Design an enzyme around this catalytic site. Structure first.
Site, PDB file in Angstrom:
ATOM      1  N   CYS A  96      -6.368 -28.508  10.436  1.00 17.00           N
ATOM      2  CA  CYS A  96      -7.598 -29.288  10.521  1.00 17.00           C
ATOM      3  C   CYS A  96      -7.356 -30.775  10.314  1.00 17.00           C
ATOM      4  O   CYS A  96      -8.225 -31.586  10.649  1.00 17.00           O
ATOM      5  CB  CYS A  96      -8.626 -28.776   9.509  1.00 17.00           C
TER       6      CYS A  96
ATOM      7  N   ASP B 212       0.844  -1.184   0.000  1.00 14.40           N
ATOM      8  CA  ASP B 212       0.000   0.000   0.000  1.00 14.40           C
ATOM      9  C   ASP B 212       0.885   1.242   0.000  1.00 14.40           C
ATOM     10  O   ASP B 212       2.106   1.170   0.173  1.00 14.40           O
ATOM     11  CB  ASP B 212      -0.952   0.008   1.201  1.00 14.40           C
TER      12      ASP B 212
HETATM   13 ZN   LIG Z   1      -8.306 -25.804   8.927  1.00 11.83          ZN
END
Ligand SMILES: [Zn+2]
Ligand SMILES: CNc1nc2c(CC[C@H]3O[C@@H](OC)[C@@H]4OC(C)(C)O[C@@H]43)c3nc(N)[nH]c(=O)c3cc2[nH]1
Ligand SMILES: CNc1nc2c(CC[C@H]3O[C@@H](OC)[C@@H]4OC(C)(C)O[C@@H]43)c3nc(N)[nH]c(=O)c3cc2[nH]1
Ligand SMILES: [Zn+2]
Lengths: 340, 340
Positions: free
Chosen positions: A280, A80
């Site tokens: 996960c 930016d």
């Molecule tokens: Zn995950």
């Protein structure tokens, strides 16, 4: 060897598009989420211009070889402009010319013009004065960018539309930006506390004002549902501090909405955070809960990795469903489950 | 299928040994460094018994499937006994019987007897009274351990020598422990502020009192030079919070000694932290300096990973040099460079 900058749209559904930006350092698939590069060990990452110019300094980064070598990231980098007080610039010194040079020294691939992000709410007169100055600054950014051969030949420059929530000012800004000419166009001045209905309302008329054949970058957005709605309105690129900020503070994004993993209801929950990511795979909600409650840095790191991975899985599902002509259905299924 | 517990010494040099502990969940190469399991994503890791019994609780860990499933670590796990006030135990309730049961519920592979870590300094009379109680508690730990068939048949039990810095008490403790009979023997009650010369002095006479054919675990040690010196005196196993603690506070271990990466002298240092680890591959001192100075969790995580990796490279070099009959030379080269 890829070109300096080539945007091609592969498929459309309503206002949504999917495609690719080709740059010398790699290909960016759109719609794209662009994470902060310092978040973890995405086709493009963000550099924190304002921070980097204060520590260690842009010249020091340049002496160390530029941001790509510094961070170990050989793919594209967006910076930016640092603006997020006078006609020359801002003292706190930063100007269109200085902002462009700083981004040059950092070595970024996508350079943001130096603008003035109008505060919200704003009167029409204030929004107009601010937009008009940003447009003069955008022309100065263009010229500074073009004066540096290495930058002009290897980087790309995006202009930032301003004008607050006013359709006539947004139109004037888009016209000024298109007449100058940029490689991509950001919709600036949103995600400043206006709320999602208002932001969507402004996007409804603002995005079609931009050149259709150039990428559209919605700065500062956002939550997963903000992103889905903004893709539906023609946005191609996103950045947001939420996935990395939330990870430190215990918030995980899932297809069933955000959860606070510190909450006692997760202390015996053996399900994974949501997801295909490495977190996960091996880690239960219960163990991440435990790590974060215990103050272990591993917990925050795993939460951040999950959130980053979730955003990229979201963008992949968005790209696939647009390509397959089922994005409208995806958006509907996403919202029903996310807000259930 | 491996045995419950088998220690075999493959090579010796002076008092130093190298070999393997075979357990049902895997092989531990010795001398071994055993890191805290919650440090990062080693042949054995440590579980924090005292913490785990307070959150979420040993019964909850058991309901969640035990520590191996909880943490995603299928290899051996060592737990301390939690002691680190009356003949029955300590109220704050914890006793030899309760400590063993807690470690049973956690599912650990190497179980520490419940002891009383004598404060330093200590009079001979206080050190004797404390050692004598620990020996009575060690017999109670043995009996509790043996009463639980799943534990007695699949786990191992280590006794902890006490006696402060007194050779006659250390001898009495070793005799009591050997007469009870344990799978390994820890040297307890050191690394409590005595200083390295004193610790080495106590190790000089204390380690040979233990059964030579059983592993020797020096609890709480230590800095890399502490480890080298203690291997030279016959220690086989180590745990220490330093590599993980130092990582958060900016301290990295290198072959040239510890450095504080936050120091300004590293702001433009392009050399890696030291090393073969993934951190030392891609990341300069300058970038890690930047991350930590900026408060980025990535910095602490990379520092912790480097420190853990450094300790394991140290243990690998120790094992190889003992096996090759050049450990004395390695120790000398290590100290010359580490303290240069
Ligand atoms: Zn995950
Ligand atoms: C959170 N909402 C939000 N952020 C915005 C930004 C700054 C975006 C940059 O600041 C921070 C982010 O991580 C590093 O880089 C990213 C904007 N930047 C410019 N130049 N102009 C704008 O109108 C604008 C609007 C925004 N709305
Ligand atoms: C730092 N110095 C030091 N730590 C010691 C410990 C505790 C070691 C455990 O506490 C903490 C460590 O991370 C989790 O598990 C590790 C000891 N534990 C017992 N039972 N008995 C001792 O005589 C003893 C001596 C020590 N000296
Ligand atoms: Zn390293």
């Amino acid at each position: 060897d890829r070109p300096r900058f080539s945007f091609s749209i592969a498929a459309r559904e309503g206002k949504a598009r999917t495609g690719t930006i080709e740059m010398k350092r790699g290909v960016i698939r759109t719609p794209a989420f662009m994470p902060v590069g310092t978040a973890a060990t995405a086709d493009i990452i963000l550099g924190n211009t304002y921070h980097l110019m204060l520590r260690p300094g842009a010249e020091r980064i340049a002496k160390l070889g530029g941001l790509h070598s510094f961070m170990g990231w050989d793919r594209p980098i967006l910076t930016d402009s640092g603006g997020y007080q006078s006609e020359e610039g801002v003292t706190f010194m930063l100007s269109p010319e200085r902002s462009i040079e700083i981004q040059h020294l950092l070595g970024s691939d996508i350079v943001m013009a130096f603008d003035e992000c109008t505060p919200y709410p704003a009167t029409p007169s204030r929004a107009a004065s601010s937009m008009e100055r940003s447009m003069r600054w955008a022309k100065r950014s263009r010229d500074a960018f073009d004066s540096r051969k290495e930058q002009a030949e290897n980087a790309a420059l995006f202009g930032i539309q301003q004008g607050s929530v006013f359709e006539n000012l947004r139109q004037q800004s888009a016209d000024a930006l298109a007449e100058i000419g940029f490689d991509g166009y950001a919709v600036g001045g949103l995600a400043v506390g206006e709320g999602q209905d208002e932001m969507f309302r402004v996007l409804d008329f603002s995005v079609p004002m931009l050149p259709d054949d150039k990428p559209h970058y919605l700065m500062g957005v956002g939550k997963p549902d903000d992103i889905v709605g903004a893709v539906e309105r023609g946005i191609d690129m996103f950045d947001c501090v939420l996935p990395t900020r939330s990870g430190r503070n215990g918030q995980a994004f899932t297809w069933d909405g955000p959860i606070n993993i510190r909450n006692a209801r997760f202390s015996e929950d053996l399900k994974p955070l949501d997801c295909h990511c490495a977190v996960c795979q091996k880690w239960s909600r219960a163990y991440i809960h435990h790590l974060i409650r215990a103050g272990e840095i591993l917990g925050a790191m795993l939460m951040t990795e999950h959130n980053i991975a979730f955003y990229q899985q979201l963008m992949q599902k968005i790209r696939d469903s647009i390509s397959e002509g089922r994005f409208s259905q995806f958006a509907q299924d996403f919202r029903a489950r996310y807000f259930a």
